[PDB]
Design a protein around this ligand. Structure first.
Ligand SMILES: Nc1ncnc2c1ncn2[C@@H]1O[C@H](COP(=O)(O)OP(=O)(O)O)[C@@H](O)[C@H]1O
Ligand SMILES: [Mn+2]
Length: 433
């Protein structure tokens, strides 16, 4: 059963073998029946794990080993690559079958991809399989696992501590710890180091290049933000979960703020817990969690950002894809209201890719008719848009040979929320990329 007008949700529990056992079964059938197929991985790390599982099968990897093949049937790329080529003039094949792994990923690109795909199925042109243990709207934070898990609600620290949390360091196994922000992770990683622990810190931006150290290095703690929910694999016996995240929120339609950490969805909680309990020979991995879950995530900027991407993907004349139905009421918008014309869309795409700016911010710049390399907007905003570093106004040497205070016309706190984010924006403002 692969060629019909239907979207299948494959929702086996974490570790049941969606990526390693089921996926190759589908690819083999799609190859056999000559079905133009795309496989969508959330990250390059998952893409490499798919390659091990798919070795032997004719798959065209559109990901950074590629050897020429006369078989053109199954493509594999990241969610974000898929959506990006759909925004670009580059021609994306009209696949008969879409296979989305980790189809709960809530990056705006993944959300937009699911909207595009569900619209193609809804119109009779394709089939689709969404692989995820935690489909949108699940209220089960404690699904089944391969091995029994010990769940404990505790007070989870979010700052350095002197006393009160001895159970954290009095543990000899390996721990994955989900923190509410990169800054909080830094402060916690320094406390754990002080106590004689070996700590690796991961975030979404560093995940691709630094996750590999968790396999070629000795560690006691992985201190990380929510990137590791989707398909990160550690050999850990314990997960510590604050169950909270900073959330980017559009305030008064004019700016994005990072709103003070707010509980995660049951799906996120389930996915974090799902990093352990995966080995049937090891009962009693521990899931220690800091608070409750909430499904009130409509204030997250990524729902509107997904509409901004989807308004810019052509399907047929006068038709704009809707969000995947379980995600469609998360955002109030006018369909098409973010559609840019051809040259501004180009700028939008390039501000998001080489510029490395959040979708919301790239949209403000592109739709103002600013070209990609014109950085005068990073300095000409209102004084409440002044970016601080070490409690003083940040400054850069501009491409016009002047020292200017960083003061963007549109303010998005995600570009100055941590040291790495701000360094990156400072180089963008100076014209260095
Ligand atoms: N490199 C590996 N070698 C052997 N077993 C693995 C490896 N990676 C994962 N597994 C195990 O295979 C099972 C299925 O994993 P996976 O297909 O990723 O599950 P799912 O996609 O359903 O979350 C899990 O028990 C996992 O621990
Ligand atoms: Mn998987």
């Amino acid at each position: 059963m692969l060629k019909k007008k239907q979207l299948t949700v494959l929702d086996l529990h974490p570790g049941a073998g969606k990526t390693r056992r089921v996926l190759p079964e589908i690819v083999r059938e799609a190859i056999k029946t000559r079905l133009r197929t795309v496989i969508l991985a959330p990250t390059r790390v998952v893409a490499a794990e798919m390659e091990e599982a798919l070795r032997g099968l004719p798959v065209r990897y559109m990901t950074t080993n590629v050897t020429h093949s006369g078989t053109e049937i199954v493509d594999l790329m990241c969610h974000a690559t898929f959506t990006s080529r759909l925004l670009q003039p580059i021609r994306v094949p009209n696949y008969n079958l879409y296979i989305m792994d980790e189809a709960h990923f809530t990056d705006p690109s993944s959300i937009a991809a699911r909207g595009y795909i569900s619209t193609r199925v809804e119109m009779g042109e394709a089939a689709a399989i969404f692989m995820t243990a935690t489909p949108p709207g699940t209220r089960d934070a404690f699904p089944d696992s391969n091995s029994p898990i010990m769940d404990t609600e505790v007070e989870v620290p979010e700052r350095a501590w002197s006393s009160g949390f001895d159970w954290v360091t009095d543990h000899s196994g390996k721990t994955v710890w989900f923190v509410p922000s990169v800054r909080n992770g830094n402060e916690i990683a320094a406390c754990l180091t002080k106590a004689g622990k070996r700590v690796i810190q991961l975030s979404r931006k560093t995940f691709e290049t630094e996750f590999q150290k968790t396999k070629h290095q000795e560690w006691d703690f992985v201190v990380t933000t929510d990137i590791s929910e989707m398909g990160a694999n550690f050999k850990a016996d314990r997960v510590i979960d604050s169950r909270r995240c900073l959330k980017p929120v559009i305030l008064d339609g004019e700016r994005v703020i990072l709103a003070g950490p707010m509980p995660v969805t049951h799906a996120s909680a389930a996915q974090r817990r799902g990093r352990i309990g995966r080995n049937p020979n090891k009962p009693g991995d521990e899931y220690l969690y800091g608070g409750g879950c909430a499904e009130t995530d409509e204030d997250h900027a990524h729902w509107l950002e997904a509409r901004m991407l989807l308004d810019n993907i052509y399907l047929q004349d006068g038709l704009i894809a809707s969000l995947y139905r379980p995600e469609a009421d998360k955002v109030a918008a006018i369909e098409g209201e973010f559609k840019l014309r051809t040259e501004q869309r180009k700028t939008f795409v390039e501000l998001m890719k080489r510029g490395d700016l959040p979708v919301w911010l790239a949209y403000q710049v592109a739709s103002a008719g600013i070209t990609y390399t014109d950085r005068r907007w990073c300095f000409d905003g209102t004084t409440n848009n002044t970016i601080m570093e070490d409690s003083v106004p940040a400054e850069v040497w501009t491409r016009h040979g002047e020292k200017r205070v960083l003061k963007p016309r549109w303010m998005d706190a995600r570009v100055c929320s941590d040291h790495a984010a701000l360094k990156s924006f400072k180089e963008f403002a100076a014209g260095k990329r």
